[PDB]
Design an enzyme around this catalytic site. Structure first.
Site, short mmCIF file in Angstrom:
data_model
loop_
_atom_site.label_atom_id
_atom_site.label_comp_id
_atom_site.label_asym_id
_atom_site.label_seq_id
_atom_site.Cartn_x
_atom_site.Cartn_y
_atom_site.Cartn_z
N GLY A 1 38.38 -30.55 -59.03
CA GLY A 1 37.42 -30.92 -58.01
C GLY A 1 36.41 -29.82 -57.76
N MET A 2 35.49 -30.13 -56.87
CA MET A 2 34.34 -29.32 -56.53
C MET A 2 34.68 -28.35 -55.39
SD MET A 2 31.45 -31.44 -54.33
CE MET A 2 31.67 -33.07 -55.03
N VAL A 3 33.93 -27.25 -55.34
CA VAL A 3 34.06 -26.24 -54.29
C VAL A 3 32.82 -26.30 -53.43
CG1 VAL A 3 34.35 -23.83 -53.73
CG2 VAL A 3 35.52 -24.79 -55.71
N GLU B 1 32.96 -25.15 -58.96
CA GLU B 1 33.99 -26.10 -59.33
C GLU B 1 35.34 -25.42 -59.54
OE1 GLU B 1 33.34 -29.53 -60.00
OE2 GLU B 1 31.17 -29.46 -59.65
N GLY B 2 36.38 -26.05 -59.00
CA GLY B 2 37.75 -25.74 -59.37
C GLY B 2 38.15 -26.53 -60.59
N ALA B 3 39.46 -26.67 -60.78
CA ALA B 3 39.95 -27.38 -61.95
C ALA B 3 39.95 -28.89 -61.73
CB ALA B 3 41.35 -26.90 -62.32
N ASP C 1 45.26 -16.02 -66.27
CA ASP C 1 43.91 -16.51 -66.55
C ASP C 1 42.87 -15.61 -65.91
OD1 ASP C 1 42.14 -18.15 -67.90
OD2 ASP C 1 42.07 -19.71 -66.35
N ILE D 1 28.97 -25.45 -53.93
CA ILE D 1 28.99 -24.13 -54.54
C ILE D 1 29.25 -24.28 -56.04
CG2 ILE D 1 30.12 -21.92 -54.68
CD1 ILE D 1 30.70 -21.92 -51.85
N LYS E 1 38.02 -25.97 -51.61
CA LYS E 1 38.23 -26.49 -52.95
C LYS E 1 38.88 -27.87 -52.84
CE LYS E 1 41.56 -24.59 -55.48
NZ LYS E 1 42.20 -23.65 -56.46
C1 LIG Z 1 38.41 -19.62 -56.99
C2 LIG Z 1 38.85 -20.02 -58.38
C3 LIG Z 1 38.04 -21.10 -59.06
O1 LIG Z 1 38.20 -22.27 -58.81
C4 LIG Z 1 37.00 -20.69 -60.10
O2 LIG Z 1 36.41 -21.80 -60.73
C5 LIG Z 1 35.89 -19.90 -59.40
O3 LIG Z 1 34.90 -19.49 -60.35
C6 LIG Z 1 35.22 -20.76 -58.33
C7 LIG Z 1 34.45 -19.91 -57.36
C8 LIG Z 1 33.94 -20.65 -56.18
C9 LIG Z 1 33.44 -19.72 -55.10
C10 LIG Z 1 32.11 -19.30 -55.18
C11 LIG Z 1 31.55 -18.46 -54.22
O4 LIG Z 1 30.24 -18.07 -54.33
C12 LIG Z 1 32.33 -18.00 -53.17
C13 LIG Z 1 33.65 -18.40 -53.08
O5 LIG Z 1 34.35 -17.93 -52.02
C14 LIG Z 1 34.24 -19.25 -54.03
C15 LIG Z 1 35.69 -19.54 -53.83
O6 LIG Z 1 36.28 -19.17 -52.84
O7 LIG Z 1 36.34 -20.11 -54.84
C16 LIG Z 1 37.74 -20.50 -54.63
C17 LIG Z 1 37.76 -21.72 -53.73
C18 LIG Z 1 38.32 -20.78 -56.01
#
Ligand SMILES: *[C@H]1CC(=O)[C@@H](O)[C@@H](O)CCCc2cc(O)cc(O)c2C(=O)O[C@@H](C)C1
Length: 341
Positions: free
Chosen positions: A26-28, A22-24, A138, A20, A43
């Site tokens: 690592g990857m999501v 990225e977190g801080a 943030d 999907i 995450k």
């Molecule tokens: C939510 C905070 C974070 O890490 C930010 O970088 C967000 O922009 C990342 C979003 C990832 C994402 C994307 C979609 O389409 C759906 C969902 O549910 C997420 C999600 O849950 O995220 C969190 C894991 C982190």
């Protein structure tokens, strides 16, 4: 372990992984939860080489394991090795949403009804956060997640702090709290970002961005940000300057040529007048005059949604080396181990 683009070691409960964002640290990924029979977001976090990374990871976990709110994305599960020795990565499992507001605003114009409902939900979640004596610190479009029916949840509590208004004052051009475009003017002037008003400024920036699909204060670097804020708000009043006792900050503002306020309805000619009235109150220069979250919820713009009895607050507000932080992260995530207790 199953791999993506690196180890993404969440099995066997979670399968069929897709990248999907990225977190801080690592990857999501999205994944199928074979137990609950729903797809989820996961995450990946690798924080243990650095204290600051460990701090941000631990902070979020501590906060979210206490918080429960419809407009805050919670922690469903935490995956890690069974021993501290073997623990290298931590995976946080959360609800799978459809998109984030950053991506959405890149291509979609919001109707006034969408702006209203999105803003209502941001403030409803923020009311809960602030009632716990916590500051998100943030807020920005990429931290606002939407599902397919436009329900909204606030993401990332890694930058959060317990509010501390009595110790908020500091010097000029030293603080970097929040993401630049969403950063209140006082961060550059005299504030450590330890008061609730920091979050309301960010929400005002988000509202403006929902009205036009462009950031309202797009500073090109740290020092440029205040140029953009003052370019639209105009010069601060004498009263608001007198509130800034720090000489370097006050004399910097006094050294500037007079700047006129740009009327909100000229920047946003198609916006709802009630939305612009609330926008003005959120983007108030003086943080003590800036609207608070419970006032914002009661503003006429939100009258179709406002219901204080359905805007809950926190039951248990928060009152106050990496090796010990790794140990603390291990301890705080123990409840999710299959044979935990
Ligand atoms: C939510 C905070 C974070 O890490 C930010 O970088 C967000 O922009 C990342 C979003 C990832 C994402 C994307 C979609 O389409 C759906 C969902 O549910 C997420 C999600 O849950 O995220 C969190 C894991 C982190």
């Amino acid at each position: 372990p199953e791999m993506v683009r690196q180890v993404f070691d969440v099995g066997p409960r979670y399968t069929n992984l897709s990248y999907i964002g990225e977190g801080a640290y690592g990857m999501v990924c999205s994944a199928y939860d074979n137990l609950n029979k729903v797809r989820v977001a996961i995450k990946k976090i690798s924080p243990f080489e650095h204290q600051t990374y460990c701090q941000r990871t631990l902070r979020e976990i501590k906060i979210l394991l206490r918080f429960r709110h419809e407009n805050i994305i919670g922690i469903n599960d935490i995956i890690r090795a069974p021993t501290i020795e073997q623990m290298k990565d931590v995976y946080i499992v959360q609800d799978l949403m459809e998109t984030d507001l950053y991506k959405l605003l890149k291509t979609q114009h919001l109707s006034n009804d969408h702006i209203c409902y999105f803003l209502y939900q941001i403030l409803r979640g923020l009311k809960y956060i602030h009632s716990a004596n916590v500051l998100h610190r943030d807020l920005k479009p990429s931290n606002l997640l939407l599902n397919t029916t436009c329900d909204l949840k606030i993401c990332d509590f890694g930058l959060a702090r317990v509010a501390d208004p009595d110790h908020d004052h500091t010097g000029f051009l030293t603080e970097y709290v929040a993401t630049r475009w969403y950063r209140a003017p006082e961060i550059m002037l005299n504030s450590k970002g330890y008061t609730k008003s920091i979050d309301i400024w960010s929400v005002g920036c988000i509202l403006a961005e929902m009205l036009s699909n462009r950031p309202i204060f797009p500073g090109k670097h740290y020092l440029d940000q205040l140029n953009h804020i003052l370019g639209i708000l105009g010069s601060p009043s004498q009263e608001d300057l007198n509130c800034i006792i720090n000489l370097k900050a006050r004399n910097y503002l006094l050294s500037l040529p007079h700047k006129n306020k740009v009327p909100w309805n000229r920047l946003f000619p198609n916006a709802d007048s009630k939305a612009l009235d609330l926008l003005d109150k959120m983007l108030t220069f003086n943080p003590h005059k800036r609207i608070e979250v419970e006032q914002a919820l009661a503003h006429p713009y939100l009258e179709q949604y406002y219901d204080p009895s359905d805007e809950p607050i926190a039951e248990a507000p928060f009152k106050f080396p990496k090796e010990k932080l790794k140990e603390l992260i291990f301890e705080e995530t123990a409840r999710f181990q299959p044979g935990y207790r």
